[PDB]
């Protein structure tokens, strides 16, 4: 396993998404990050939670079913040497689903976050409140850094869990495989119930990484419509491939790979 | 500030380690570490599965060597949640082991002082009876049909009981069928 | 292939208000087909092209290295007849990579396009020009549509192509996999000149999806910044199932799975 | 830049430690690249398992060929961080080696001048016990069906450190049974 | 309004389709339509490769069955490694066929007018010589060890050349030997 | 300061995209050819390996 | 002249045998170099020792 550390350094090689406002993030840690069910928490969990509820149930099912078509084509070509969930759940939970789940938070929720803060710097909040002197970091960033690790990394496991739920839906429709033999045959091959419950740690650091990059682009924007739209296009430049540092580090430990 | 399905999905995940993790999990709380020698095994790796009477009981803990004769010293992760003879079965063992000691020819002709040490041997069994008995037979079998070895314990018939720290004598970990044919 | 077609009916489902722009997309060369390097035209080409060159190389190292350990573990678990790139480059070039490419183009650059068009109505062009009667279709569709769709279906295939070109670089660095056996193995595993040639078509269809989805939501947005983020939310919902419907159908028909 | 680009420290710190964590180790003090001559082994792959008394200790590095003589000099990546004797036990090993040196009538009642070269020989004998073993025997065996070769080592005595290019005694480097099948 | 490397990478992809699609193709230009009757072949698919001494020489054009006579009709598509003959190579095997026509006892006792039509036969069958000899041998070989049924046709030695419309005599493609083994 | 790393990574990958189908490659710059006749070789594939004393030194062209 | 043109370079006249690498197929062509004249390259002939009489096909019919 020489690819454990090689995945990590890819993220480290370029860090311009965090760096410019890293000093402000360090100041939040210094001053002690906030916690509690506030109005910020409600809209942060709207973007992360509520919106994603329908995305994960509907698109997340068919994503899994496309990866189950790949599973099916192995049954057609190879068969008996990779039967049922030998080569299906194996890479799905541990290697494949995680990246696509990150594109719904590092990508989609991150873009939304950027859009909100940039516009409050131009209008509703920070346009007036910086000038008043109601500490900006404590006001809108400090409790939403804490919010990022509450629901978001559980949702990455739930996303992946839906693939397994979809696996038994079409075990019969692609061919005629009894759902109970598919699932329990799968269970045994990858030690499913023990590893999938232990692997809920993988993306907690990723939640933190998503919010360290996305907040910067909204927070230090030029609050004009040209500066704000440029910063939204800069959000996906840095947040898209800097959230995968700890894939095999905790896949080997928590998912037991 | 969250929905109702957060919780529902979380409970669905919690159900998956209710019984699974009790069987399969953690590492020192449900196992005993024992040793045995091997001479030359064609396909053994650390964490290779270990069985008893065709049922997997655990795995290889780690593999080391013995410099003096340059042979293998394999440490085992054996099933320690299976007590085998527990405290209710201990009541039977105290009489069954004593009767095997009582009617033997080495104790009926013994000095009465020595006959009184048969119950001292019960005490030593009481503090060493979790797991397996004295006489066990270790051999090298295969997992599938190709290669990859699978270590197997075949319970024999002895007097004492073994636990972590004890060593089982090698029965059959030497013969390679390729060397049998070619030499 | 009926169950595949059954699941692959998502290409029709996600068309809400999009279908109003039917003759709007037709009449974009009505009022004089312009072409060339322009101010916004080239910036969309940076978002689709120039920036994506770095995304392609680094996401290819993320995918490549993860499936490089998988390649090794297949040797260990299954055997020597499906080792290394025999059964990994098989699935990677052919069926796997294409999905991620669509998410990092149809998703990422599609929404970025929309976001810019939305602001013409709110501030810079269409706000003043529709009211006068300066041809709306020529105004914002014709010089922005073409910018993001000419190199796009080539680039979708190049995403996956670089996973093979860079796959032998890290096949050598992780283990020592011979470059020529990787290359000749690759060709034979997918029957490249008939199947991957048809996967180019699959990616043209993905470019054609960008022409329906992205245009309408920018064209009739609400000129507020919250209406713009709602319009970007809508494009993630629309593009996420249209691509998956074709991942079912054209994997079975263009590739032949 | 301490600001704007502040995190250059965080970029520089982890980028090269992770790089060498994957790539090396190293095995420069924990491994040596020793060579041996083989004559006709069908199917030796790079990174194939090289074992000793069943236990893998290293792997295949690379192969150097000579068309004229039709011989192959195979380089092995062998670990040098294996098991050994402590100071009192190693003293007993060289006393037993000294008894083999004093078995002959030339060095039984040795002149102290001659004893100096016998103690040099005891140093030579200790060098191959664990680190770069010279005096040993090599034979090719199989793990899987035919391919998936498993090389074996049977250690002998000891002769200083093995030099790169100095061959290891060939017991069985002619793995070709097509003439057995044909005749 | 575009970049540079887009195009360059697309040119590299053309060279990869050139090798596969240039190899695999045409269908009546480098071969001819011929038939063969089979009684039991396990798993023959349309466009499955047809071989010869381990060398792909063509593929299955189409496969149908006729239960009235209970035999399967396979049409064939030869590849472009041999189209059949060059201009002088066609003349060379016409002269060799003419010598077989002249040496045969049927034509030495023929009417002189009929002896003059021995070359007329070669003129009239100028496009029917394409390509292999009349008598060809049928069997099913393997690409793996049992499965991966690989249809094999090895031309033997006939009287004329195998032309379009002919049926290849089936030698060894009827013998299902599972019943021999099991009864 | 981007062109610094185009060169380092961009031209390195350009060299490796040219060395896919034209590895040796077009003109056989690092190899030579051999010819032989066979009558029956069930299992000899194009790009199958060619050896000396069990070590690969070439392949089928 | 014969002595000077019969000792230069790797030897030309090599002898070959057909057999598999592992257990499947993928015939691994063996080479046992003999004694020839020039560098082994295009224009030289490899001598077939064992690539004709397959006894397993005779058994299987």
Residue numbers in the entry:
A (entry chain G), C (entry chain H): 1 to 257
B (entry chain C), D (entry chain D), E (entry chain F): 9 to 191
F (entry chain E): 9 to 69
G (entry chain E): 131 to 191
Paper text:
We next used cryo-electron microscopy to characterize the architecture of the A. baumannii MlaBDEF complex (abMlaBDEF). Following 2D- and 3D-classification, we obtained a final dataset of ~14,000 particles with which we obtained a structure to a resolution of 8.7 Å. Based on the bioinformatically-predicted localization of individual proteins and work recently performed on the similar E. coli Mla complex (ecMlaBDEF), we propose that MlaD localizes to the periplasmic side of the IM, MlaE forms the central transmembrane region, and MlaF and MlaB form the bottom layer on the cytoplasmic face of the IM with two visible hetero-dimers. We note that a clear six-fold symmetry is present for the region of the map attributed to MlaD, despite the fact that we only imposed a 2-fold symmetry averaging. We next modeled abMlaD, using an evolution restraints-derived structural model of ecMlaD as a template, and used our previously-published EM-guided symmetry modeling procedure to model its hexameric state. The localization of this extra density suggests that it corresponds to a ~ 45 amino-acid insert present between strands 4 and 5 of the abMlaD β-sheet. Interestingly, the arrangement of MlaF clearly resembles the pre-translocation state of MalK. The resulting MlaE dimer model fits well to the EM map density, and clearly corresponds to a closed transporter, with no solvent channel between the subunits. Interestingly, we also noted clear density for three TM helices that likely correspond to the MlaD N-terminal helices.
